[PDB]
Design a protein around this ligand. Structure first.
Ligand SMILES: [Ca+2]
Ligand SMILES: [Cl-]
Ligand SMILES: [Cl-]
Ligand SMILES: [Cl-]
Ligand SMILES: [Cl-]
Ligand SMILES: [Fe+2]
Ligand SMILES: [Fe+2]
Ligand SMILES: [Fe+2]
Ligand SMILES: [Fe+2]
Lengths: 360, 359, 360, 361
């Protein structure tokens, strides 16, 4: 059932800015994000760790908060002006959503902020005010071989992609790429504000769940180094999928799992989307180059596993099951199909994955 | 067991070229020249002679049109002309069939000896070769995926220790191997030129040629080969990778030519030229040994390999391996692998890593 | 004298989009831009060559036009909507500037367009409508080892940097970085619309002249390959300066010269500037890490040579001499000075360039 | 004749360059350069010495820093194939009439039976086989730096008569891969190898004996860029002497930097294979402006004039003999010099100055 376009104007969203993840063991989480991945500590105490990427000047891109159940607490977007926080509040109130306004913020280093339970059940934050910190972009004395340089995007699991897509377009996101079939089903959509391929994305599945948070590197070798280091630390079992080249987005990528199974993507070298008529690319769901351009198989956990999200009271949001077709099932499941070249039987896969594999 | 001859081994410098029989020369040319960017030293209607960016000898790869795709010769360069005579005396003492051609078997090679070696492989030894323009600074020709050197061969043979002892007597030094706790050897790597290997033995039914490997300068050059194959919509010919190897520590990719000959692209292994270079043995169940990142080894990697020819041009009969199968003990229904030895977390039983089983 | 701020609203400028350069020998220029640099031909005839970068979807990023005197004919910015071309016309008419509007464009592949002789003497174009072409961003079968992936910026030589800066700020560009001294002189300023360090920049000098046009690559090795290729072609004398790391912008860079001496920069890996409170950075003109972070000397031609620009009648604009202090003279001239560490005599240079050189 | 005659005694079989011992004046400041800035790995340290190795090394060290009163090269060490090659080295240099010192338990920690010699060009060479093996760090990506130095690649020596030194090194088994000459018959520089890269040592024409540099490898070109970027961030870009660049000779990507005592260190990657015995030898003309930097960037004058003192076996600085052959600096970038981009083309040539608009400071 369609989400109506408010009469109230949408807040002017700049970009994704930070995520707040609830973690069960703060020290174990710190080891992963600081010792393994090299993120920079803006502040920490016994309850939280505030982390930022190499080129960031706002206070943080990730807040790790100790709690009893691992989950997304907030995905936060920065808006253009202080007045845009009021616009966000009016907009979501018109949508009939639950909102909470804190003039001095929900986390350290953020000022006036609005959190909402959005129409898809996700906890979004909108803020302008943030404490500036030392921008480390030329601190090559600190630069890691695997350095994470920016926060790039979020990716959300939701059962009805077109419903969510309309809502995000009304909010001002522009769809850059999607995955559909020839029977009218949408499996995934990518959408932006900042002029990269995306600031968030929708992946079809049971939800609301958080699929991943993505950080950028400068170069491909930086992503390779993360893999290599994970090998050396004998934690290659925490490499979920990749490294690879995406079809959708054209970015070089890697998916890894934190200690609470929150999925983190490392990402580089997508393209510019800032023109308002940026061409929107649709891939067919059976195209075996759409997710991994090299045709490597998508690991099944990528389609089945994702993080819980919290409501504004701190309780886990109920999951609504997807009724639309499953991307897993139609591509790599027993009745699935994929191709390398459209219309060619040679290099096609029937009821299994590419490269000689089946689902475990 | 293969006895050590009284005759001295020829002094082998390095792997130098492979001669592959291909069924459609134009389709093979597309792959090796248009897709992969190797440089043409000579061609006609019957053969294409190719070399890498930094090579000064005539060629690293000869593609010969023939009825059955197969390895025709894997050639090693020896230090002096007199080493070809040593090779002949050596293989005659071993009781092997040999053929000597004072003017070579292929263009751009002079005095050469071909043998059917004790493992059934067609080896060539030569010194004399026609020098060509070394293209190492020809950056006007340099491809984003440029192949810069020939690095090694990899051979499938059923009894790895038997082959390893023979290659050690021939002067190759083992650098790395894969074994299990119960004393089975699955693979060994061995060198002359001071890299991890010039050839390698992979346990399996043989003789078959597993692959020929070329080097790039950097990891991004290997990524570009993958990217290009996607753009050409031939990603189905990317067999396995890209990855980081455990054994050798090299960044790698395996692709398949039009006759299913497997080619590896490889970079950034380490120096092995000291005579006490430490050997490294990996456990077969270690899921970081072949792909350091734990990505699963695709089953075709263990099962598929190229036929090899005898000196009459006929396919060599295959002898079955009786020792344990690396595929079966790691990714088969009764196999297992680990991330950390002794840890059930991050271990895989009856299937491959990353959530896959065999198709 | 100060350029007034119009009452009329500024057009919403998206980004730098293309340059039109006049060249004297179209075949020799084609060899440089297509055969040496690998740019992609959108259209060509006996009078013009239209070129685009690897990731571009608009018709072109560079038009080479045969003519009698090598010069910049137009520096074009894309605007957000067709209505913004009307806004640009009103804005420049209010400024008292010569304008010319053509509903079907000045070059192939551009529609309704406004060209102006701006207050600094530069031929600016504003357009929205453009012919979309095949985006080559995943055409790795065409990808060069030195592939140019995007148009990044222009750089303009103008005698009075503060005067120009105020004008560009009123027009909506946001200053990201600048170079000044302790006596109130501004030597250069960088300013953006699209969320990178810049879309254009002002370099103090006799003007109007065009200093350079810059294209991006994905990675640093792509820039090194251009150098290597130019060595193999035995045209290393056309490598003007670099490769290096910039202080200002933090980008990896190279400056080369086309057959008519137009300067082309290759550039990669600057940072995100899209937030409205993006911190500005001011460098001192005597800081020897400001232009080349590694302290390599700035070649003197970089300060003295730049391209002629045309007015709307196709005639070369008269050059007005800078009276403010010269960056060349105050840093590497006979009475100049530069430092490695502020206040440290060790690693400072008096009356000469860094690394043991004087001016030839 | 000045020739160094070939001994009748067989040459030791030399594997490769292995380590250098450098005397430094302030051990803590040197440690901060080699460990904290460059990321070399500690094999042993005390208040007098620091022993360091590269990422892929299995022998005990590639560099020994020894506190002393005068910064200088104390020894440039080559590993030999077998224990018996140390005896061969001793007999070889004794036949040449050189001062030798044999220590059956080594001169530095982690090296066993070793011979040091004052060689015929005045350099302190060491030959050894026995060395303490350590953990090879080649897969320790948890320790890998963005600028990681992976191997010791070569030494480079300044000596006044390049042909005289070249013949001596060839007799010792080094093979020349590249050199720089002019049409008048002067040799300015030569590169020579044992291990199958472009070189293990090299001769640069100039006043000597002096040590021009010690060179370490990286995996990739971005690793070298990172060293530069890090030195900028540390505000020690004045210690970047020359580069980064692409060499003509060797085809390697390179950078030259200066340690706290002004010992020059090169970072180097991606030269080519030279192991075949008929490896084609490449001669460049001294006036070719692409021979040293392929992109035609000018060679910094200090690169031609400055180099490190070397010690004799008593720890005293070796007397320096002046070059009488033509100077590479003078004939290329000096007042009466010249260079070209294209041979025979005045366009892209430089006369009485360097390339890119620069004169000598
Ligand atoms: Ca269908
Ligand atoms: Cl994906
Ligand atoms: Cl493997
Ligand atoms: Cl600059
Ligand atoms: Cl040099
Ligand atoms: Fe993503
Ligand atoms: Fe291999
Ligand atoms: Fe620029
Ligand atoms: Fe060197």
């Amino acid at each position: 059932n369609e989400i109506p376009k408010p009469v109230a104007p949408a807040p002017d969203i700049l970009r994704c800015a930070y995520a707040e993840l609830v973690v069960t063991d703060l020290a174990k989480s710190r080891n992963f994000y600081v010792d393994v991945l090299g993120l920079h500590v803006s502040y920490e105490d016994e309850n939280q760790i505030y982390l930022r990427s190499f080129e960031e000047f706002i206070h943080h891109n990730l807040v790790l908060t100790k709690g009893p159940v691992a989950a997304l607490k907030a995905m936060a977007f920065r808006v253009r002006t202080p007045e845009d926080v009021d616009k966000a509040e009016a907009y979501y109130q018109e949508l009939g959503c639950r909102t909470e306004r804190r003039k001095d913020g929900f986390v350290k280093g953020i000022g006036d902020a609005l959190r909402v339970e959005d129409p898809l059940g996700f906890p979004y934050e909108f803020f302008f005010e943030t404490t500036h910190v030392e921008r480390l972009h030329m601190r090559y004395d600190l630069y890691s071989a695997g350095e994470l340089v920016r926060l790039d995007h979020f990716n959300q699991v939701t059962p009805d992609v077109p419903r969510g897509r309309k809502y995000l377009e009304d909010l001002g996101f522009r769809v850059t790429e999607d995955i559909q079939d020839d029977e009218g089903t949408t499996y995934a959509a990518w959408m932006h504000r900042k002029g990269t391929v995306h600031d968030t994305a929708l992946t079809g599945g049971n939800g609301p769940r958080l699929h991943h948070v993505a950080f950028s590197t400068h170069e491909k070798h930086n992503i390779i180094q993360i893999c290599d280091k994970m090998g050396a630390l004998r934690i290659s079992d925490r490499i979920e999928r990749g490294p690879g080249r995406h079809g959708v987005s054209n970015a070089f990528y890697l998916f890894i799992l934190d200690p609470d199974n929150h999925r983190i993507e490392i990402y580089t070298q997508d393209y510019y989307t800032g023109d308002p008529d940026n061409p929107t690319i649709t891939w067919n769901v059976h195209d075996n180059q759409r997710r991994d351009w090299w045709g490597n198989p998508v690991v099944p956990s990528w389609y089945t596993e994702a993080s819980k999200v919290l409501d504004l009271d701190g309780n886990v949001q109920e999951i609504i099951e997807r009724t639309d077709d499953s991307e897993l099932e139609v591509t790599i499941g027993a009745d699935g199909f994929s191709f390398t070249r459209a219309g060619d039987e040679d290099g096609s896969y029937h009821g299994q994955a590419s490269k000689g594999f089946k689902l475990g």
